[PDB]
DNA sequence: CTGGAGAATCCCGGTGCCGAGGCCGCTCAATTGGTCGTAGACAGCTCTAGCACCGCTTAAACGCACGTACGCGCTGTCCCCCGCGTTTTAACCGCCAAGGGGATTACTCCCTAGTCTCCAGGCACGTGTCAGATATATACATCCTGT
DNA sequence: ACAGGATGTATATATCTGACACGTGCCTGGAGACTAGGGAGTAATCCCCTTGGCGGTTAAAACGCGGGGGACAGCGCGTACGTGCGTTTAAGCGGTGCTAGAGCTGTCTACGACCAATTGAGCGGCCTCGGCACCGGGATTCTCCAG
């Protein structure tokens, strides 16, 4: 009787709960008080990044010709991208494995 | 009879295992290690099984990249040999001793 | 899409001819071109013509073409098969590079050959020693090369 | 039978919206919310510290936009300040 | 005891393969197992430390990923 | 001969500054934010990002806008020889 | 009157305003801090062929990937002059 | 007869002489005007305190310091004395700066 | 402001190397010795500046240096 | 008329101060409430830390004919002491040098 | 004229209980501040990580001395659990 | 391998100073005394999951020969880096002057915490089908010894 | 450089299967509406400190020249490790069984946040003298060339 909730992700065209972003915030032991635009804006970033991330992981997958993203093409996408290398290059993926990647001086003189 | 010389079964075996993602430790004896290793501090403890496989995740990339450190410390030593000299030069570069 | 590519080269190129040198297709595989260029004005080449073929590549532009001398020609870079050793052709060729423009580099190299890095070390011996009769060489080589 | 909450609904969305023909396996579901967590992890920690030093108390799209700013490298930092910052302005506009 | 000896000689091999090695001396089986081993009791005592201040008696998949993070080897997948 | 002038408008309507509306000095687009004024529009605005879009300039080296300064002298010859 | 250096000035924005690298009409601009141009899809048969950083085409070095951005300042203006120079062909 | 010592003895003896002092070995002066020449292409006219700068500074010969110790053990293992190019950049690329 | 970069003399770079007790110096460390000097200066002074135009102002404060020191895990102690 | 007015760093017997440290936690941000001996054994353990490092500084300081501590003083012990420079290994110190040492190799022989 | 806060005080109480004739350069005194500050928030920090971690919203002598034990390497750990033990009774002795 | 010459280094004494050390407000941040709502300790029930064990498979581990390719020691070189005298340059110290911007207080108001009500979007739990794993049969690329 | 034999190695088709993508039921956390209270944003003012310049000193830097140590290419030798094959062993799987400890709900009380009144502890400021930095001079020692 009052109005119809539109979801807050809604009303800024967001898929990432805008919500339970503010609820980690203000019980995240972070401040006593939280801005209203801090969660809008921290979803959007985070969308940003697991889009690029979900994208590359496509590109490689769909490169080796599977239609599910297992942690082999997260980790090559991710290490192969320069910038999201040193961003991530200090974490560490289950089943992810190394780069096939071989010394000049060890292959054959040929 | 036929004889491969030394040089390609290793790049052949480098070549399968950098495209591998299992587990190239076996999971007994490293368990039996990991429970050994933890009954020092406290006894009797308990593990789960995806405890253990996130130890035996870690460790061995933590191997692999001072392998290969370490293998770039002999190209640098003009070698292709890996020697302990090189373990210990790449272990007390990246601040671990 | 290397197909088209090769279209617009040769477009252009016929409303705007080039100066002295030409090209064009020997068919309808318009991967396999000839090229005549002429020897470089006062220059050890001047007066002959060489006549050179090119081999698209199946991702042209993304790749450079197979380009050899079917004329011979005394050069410290170029051997005896018509095989030429140009940077522009190995490592820093960009789908930029057009035939036009490469052609042009082909008549530089012929002013100025590279000794530093020969496909004919003997010849390139003869460039930097005595730059002098080395023209006397590459000259009497274009009649009965070139000519 | 406790209620637990994860970012997997919310990942296949935005996959079916980029990718409309990939789908995710359960350890990799798992490795990407982990990943978003600990961005998380590093934005909030950055934007309370980023709040605390200036003798502040709220926090705000100014200090988080900072934090972004200072973790995210390069023209990722870039893309992703105009990105939040179009997706507020356009959340207070309605 | 003798546990250390588990990882099999072929095992440091593999695993030198896979981080691109050529080839092998004799002297670094016995200082790869040491610094393996090093790293553990790195580990477990910072895994045990937290499930004894948690009032656990078991080793939980979260306290060892924990332990990871505080050394600046954060792992992902397990929570 | 009569669509030329509708030419020439729409010409300047997509090049003309937005803050002078008269001709352009060396103005650059700083990136993403459409910006159109001139150089000396922003020359004494330089800070807060941007004088609207308030985004931070990335682009510390200048990166001077070529083809549009080559757009907009042939926009003159155009000009100059469509008023004979 | 003066007609065919209209048509040769005409010719001198196509040509600025042509593919550099894929000589084909830009259809709307993608633009790297270098400000070339390109026509779509080269930078993707770019990051094809290779598995590494990308190379400056026109230039030398100035381009890593969706670095570019959506530049929409000729999009609007392509399909605009080709109506006045069809028109115009049409008129005289 | 001009005496001159073996090349190495001095450098032993300034190693020793700085490795025992604490005083600052870059140039202020210039540093400062290299500092606040990276600063300008962020920020115009940006206002520096001594202090900050000298914390810089105190960043800077403890950072190079540092790779100097990492790149001379990176060279005595490459069974040489003489530091090269490819020394630091082997320390740097092992450490995780590259 | 410009060209200063060669203001980091050969003597300084000498003294800076063998504090860390180096005992010879090839000829080719200079100019890169200035390189990763540099990349270091851009790496502290971009957070730091930052820093600074957040609490908007125009001034950099050594607290804000030090600031940046301890986000890149090399925190600096005589400054507060 | 109430009570003599006792520090709590009195009640546990240490020169740190406890009711600062109570405070600094309250309104550091680290829970919406404290117990009451978390900054008691806080205050304790850095009261403990700095004793060490300034006996530590003090014993250089003596050790180099000097009565004033300086960071020379503090860098050395620090760098010392194993323990001390594991727990402070990436931290530096302002004008405090580096300790004298020369690998054999080249030491003339 | 505003009002500025450090530990100047106890350390230099500090220093004359352990060597009652020596004595400290101000930039010594500096670097102390700043070394017992970092202490400071290693510990707060590490503590709430340990309050987070356990569902926990009290920080509890426990979590600070698991804190202590989580950081300090050895045998400070064994001494600094000990002293703040003994402190922690004493206090709660009067 | 054993001695003088020189040069740097170390040790000792007189001198001036400014920074460490100490004392006087005083103000606010510490204390003390009540009060209340609540989070953690404690008890009890449980059942998921971890621990232990037995039997069959066989891949992987282990041991031994070999011979070859790489680690490593000795040799010559020349050129590149180091020790040192000389001239120059800009760092460095001291002083002075203008002011912009950092550092306070007043005050308001507008943003945000807190609360109650309502519901739906997200979580727990079946659920079948297709992507993916595996077998087997290939075609095919690449090493390797002989020519 | 080339070629055939042999050892891997990429490819396609067929078949099982269980993990995922979806669907359904349900609830509590998010949303809407309202309220009150203080965080801070703006304006005004004060002045510490940054910036800028000028002038004299000289110490450090640039430059150069001789010359010798070492980085490097080369060669030869010798042990050591990749490659292969025959002989185990224990990982691996499965299947079963047992129960301890994690995980949940329900109480209940100590206990920490909160507020009000008070006072003394540490800080700003303001002296004051000796630890030391410096200068000068004499004694000690290590490298180097000659013997
Ligand atoms: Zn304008
Ligand atoms: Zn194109």
Same mark, same amino acid.
């Given at each position: 009787?009052?109005?119809?909730?539109?979801?807050?992700?809604?009303?800024?065209?967001?898929?990432?709960?805008?919500?339970?972003?503010?609820?980690?915030?203000?019980?995240?032991?972070?401040?006593?008080?939280?801005?209203?635009?801090?969660?809008?804006?921290?979803?959007?970033?985070?969308?940003?990044?697991?889009?690029?991330?979900?994208?590359?992981?496509?590109?490689?997958?769909?490169?080796?010709?599977?239609?599910?993203?297992?942690?082999?093409?997260?980790?090559?996408?991710?290490?192969?991208?320069?910038?999201?290398?040193?961003?991530?290059?200090?974490?560490?993926?289950?089943?992810?494995?190394?780069?096939?990647?071989?010394?000049?001086?060890?292959?054959?003189?040929? | 009879?036929?004889?491969?010389?030394?040089?390609?079964?290793?790049?052949?075996?480098?070549?399968?295992?950098?495209?591998?993602?299992?587990?190239?430790?076996?999971?007994?004896?490293?368990?039996?290690?990991?429970?050994?290793?933890?009954?020092?501090?406290?006894?009797?403890?308990?593990?789960?099984?995806?405890?253990?496989?996130?130890?035996?995740?870690?460790?061995?990339?933590?191997?692999?990249?001072?392998?290969?450190?370490?293998?770039?410390?002999?190209?640098?030593?003009?070698?292709?040999?890996?020697?302990?000299?090189?373990?210990?030069?790449?272990?007390?570069?990246?601040?671990?001793? | 899409?290397?197909?088209?590519?090769?279209?617009?080269?040769?477009?252009?190129?016929?409303?705007?001819?080039?100066?002295?040198?030409?090209?064009?297709?020997?068919?309808?595989?318009?991967?396999?071109?000839?090229?005549?260029?002429?020897?470089?004005?006062?220059?050890?080449?001047?007066?002959?013509?060489?006549?050179?073929?090119?081999?698209?590549?199946?991702?042209?532009?993304?790749?450079?073409?197979?380009?050899?001398?079917?004329?011979?020609?005394?050069?410290?870079?170029?051997?005896?098969?018509?095989?030429?050793?140009?940077?522009?052709?190995?490592?820093?060729?960009?789908?930029?590079?057009?035939?036009?423009?490469?052609?042009?580099?082909?008549?530089?190299?012929?002013?100025?050959?590279?000794?530093?890095?020969?496909?004919?070390?003997?010849?390139?011996?003869?460039?930097?020693?005595?730059?002098?009769?080395?023209?006397?060489?590459?000259?009497?080589?274009?009649?009965?090369?070139?000519? | 039978?406790?209620?637990?909450?994860?970012?997997?609904?919310?990942?296949?969305?935005?996959?079916?919206?980029?990718?409309?023909?990939?789908?995710?396996?359960?350890?990799?579901?798992?490795?990407?919310?982990?990943?978003?967590?600990?961005?998380?992890?590093?934005?909030?920690?950055?934007?309370?510290?980023?709040?605390?030093?200036?003798?502040?108390?709220?926090?705000?799209?100014?200090?988080?936009?900072?934090?972004?700013?200072?973790?995210?490298?390069?023209?990722?930092?870039?893309?992703?300040?105009?990105?939040?910052?179009?997706?507020?302005?356009?959340?207070?506009?309605? | 005891?003798?546990?250390?000896?588990?990882?099999?000689?072929?095992?440091?091999?593999?695993?030198?393969?896979?981080?691109?090695?050529?080839?092998?001396?004799?002297?670094?089986?016995?200082?790869?197992?040491?610094?393996?081993?090093?790293?553990?009791?790195?580990?477990?005592?910072?895994?045990?430390?937290?499930?004894?201040?948690?009032?656990?008696?078991?080793?939980?998949?979260?306290?060892?990923?924990?332990?990871?993070?505080?050394?600046?080897?954060?792992?992902?997948?397990?929570? | 001969?009569?669509?030329?002038?509708?030419?020439?408008?729409?010409?300047?309507?997509?090049?003309?500054?937005?803050?002078?509306?008269?001709?352009?000095?060396?103005?650059?687009?700083?990136?993403?934010?459409?910006?159109?004024?001139?150089?000396?529009?922003?020359?004494?605005?330089?800070?807060?990002?941007?004088?609207?879009?308030?985004?931070?300039?990335?682009?510390?080296?200048?990166?001077?806008?070529?083809?549009?300064?080559?757009?907009?002298?042939?926009?003159?010859?155009?000009?100059?020889?469509?008023?004979? | 009157?003066?007609?065919?250096?209209?048509?040769?000035?005409?010719?001198?924005?196509?040509?600025?305003?042509?593919?550099?690298?894929?000589?084909?009409?830009?259809?709307?601009?993608?633009?790297?801090?270098?400000?070339?141009?390109?026509? @779509?899809?080269?930078?993707?048969?770019?990051?094809?062929?290779?598995?590494?950083?990308?190379?400056?085409?026109?230039?030398?070095?100035?381009?890593? @990937?969706?670095?570019?951005?959506?530049?929409?300042?000729?999009?609007?203006?392509?399909?605009?002059?080709? @109506?006045?120079?069809?028109?115009?062909?049409?008129?005289?």
């Amino acid at each position: 009787a009052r109005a119809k909730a539109k979801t807050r992700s809604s009303r800024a065209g967001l898929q990432f709960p805008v919500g339970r972003v503010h609820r980690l915030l203000r019980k995240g032991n972070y401040s006593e008080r939280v801005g209203a635009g801090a969660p809008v804006y921290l979803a959007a970033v985070l969308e940003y990044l697991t889009a690029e991330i979900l994208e590359l992981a496509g590109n490689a997958a769909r490169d080796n010709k599977k239609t599910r993203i297992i942690p082999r093409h997260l980790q090559l996408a991710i290490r192969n991208d320069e910038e999201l290398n040193k961003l991530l290059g200090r974490v560490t993926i289950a089943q992810g494995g190394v780069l096939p990647n071989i010394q000049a001086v060890l292959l054959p003189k040929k | 009879p036929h004889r491969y010389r030394p040089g390609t079964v290793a790049l052949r075996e480098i070549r399968r295992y950098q495209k591998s993602t299992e587990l190239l430790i076996r999971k007994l004896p490293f368990q039996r290690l990991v429970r050994e290793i933890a009954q020092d501090f406290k006894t009797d403890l308990r593990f789960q099984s995806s405890a253990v496989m996130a130890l035996q995740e870690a460790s061995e990339a933590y191997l692999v990249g001072l392998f290969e450190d370490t293998n770039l410390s002999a190209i640098h030593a003009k070698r292709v040999t890996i020697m302990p000299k090189d373990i210990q030069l790449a272990r007390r570069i990246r601040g671990e001793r | 899409m290397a197909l088209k590519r090769i279209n617009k080269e040769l477009s252009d190129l016929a409303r705007d001819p080039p100066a002295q040198s030409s090209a064009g297709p020997v068919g309808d595989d318009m991967f396999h071109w000839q090229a005549t260029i002429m020897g470089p004005n006062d220059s050890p080449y001047q007066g002959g013509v060489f006549f050179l073929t090119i081999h698209f590549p199946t991702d042209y532009p993304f790749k450079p073409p197979k380009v050899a001398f079917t004329t011979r020609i005394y050069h410290p870079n170029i051997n005896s098969n018509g095989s030429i050793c140009l940077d522009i052709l190995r490592s820093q060729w960009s789908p930029a590079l057009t035939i036009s423009k490469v052609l042009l580099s082909i008549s530089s190299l012929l002013s100025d050959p590279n000794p530093d890095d020969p496909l004919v070390p003997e010849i390139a011996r003869i460039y930097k020693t005595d730059r002098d009769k080395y023209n006397r060489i590459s000259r009497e080589w274009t009649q009965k090369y070139a000519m | 039978r406790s209620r637990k909450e994860s970012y997997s609904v919310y990942v296949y969305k935005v996959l079916k919206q980029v990718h409309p023909d990939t789908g995710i396996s359960s350890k990799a579901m798992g490795i990407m919310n982990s990943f978003v967590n600990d961005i998380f992890e590093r934005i909030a920690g950055e934007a309370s510290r980023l709040a605390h030093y200036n003798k502040r108390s709220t926090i705000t799209s100014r200090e988080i936009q900072t934090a972004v700013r200072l973790l995210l490298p390069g023209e990722l930092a870039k893309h992703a300040v105009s990105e939040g910052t179009k997706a507020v302005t356009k959340y207070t506009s309605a | 005891r003798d546990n250390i000896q588990g990882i099999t000689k072929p095992a440091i091999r593999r695993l030198a393969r896979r981080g691109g090695v050529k080839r092998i001396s004799g002297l670094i089986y016995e200082e790869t197992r040491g610094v393996l081993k090093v790293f553990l009791e790195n580990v477990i005592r910072d895994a045990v430390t937290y499930t004894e201040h948690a009032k656990r008696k078991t080793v939980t998949a979260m306290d060892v990923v924990y332990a990871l993070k505080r050394q600046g080897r954060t792992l992902y997948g397990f929570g | 001969w009569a669509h030329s002038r509708a030419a020439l408008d729409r010409l300047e309507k997509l090049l003309r500054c937005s803050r002078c509306t008269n001709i352009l000095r060396e103005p650059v687009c700083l990136g993403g934010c459409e910006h159109i004024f001139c150089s000396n529009c922003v020359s004494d605005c330089i800070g807060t990002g941007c004088p609207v879009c308030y985004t931070p300039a990335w682009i510390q080296d200048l990166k001077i806008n070529r083809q549009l300064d080559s757009m907009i002298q042939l926009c003159s010859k155009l000009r100059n020889l469509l008023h004979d | 009157l003066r007609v065919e250096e209209v048509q040769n000035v005409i010719n001198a924005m196509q040509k600025i305003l042509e593919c550099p690298i894929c000589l084909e009409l830009i259809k709307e601009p993608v633009s790297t801090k270098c400000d070339h141009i390109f026509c @779509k899809f080269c930078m993707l048969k770019l990051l094809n062929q290779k598995k590494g950083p990308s190379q400056c085409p026109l230039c030398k070095n100035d381009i890593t @990937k969706r670095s570019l951005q959506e530049s929409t300042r000729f999009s609007q203006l392509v399909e605009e002059l080709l @109506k006045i120079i069809c028109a115009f062909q049409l008129d005289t």
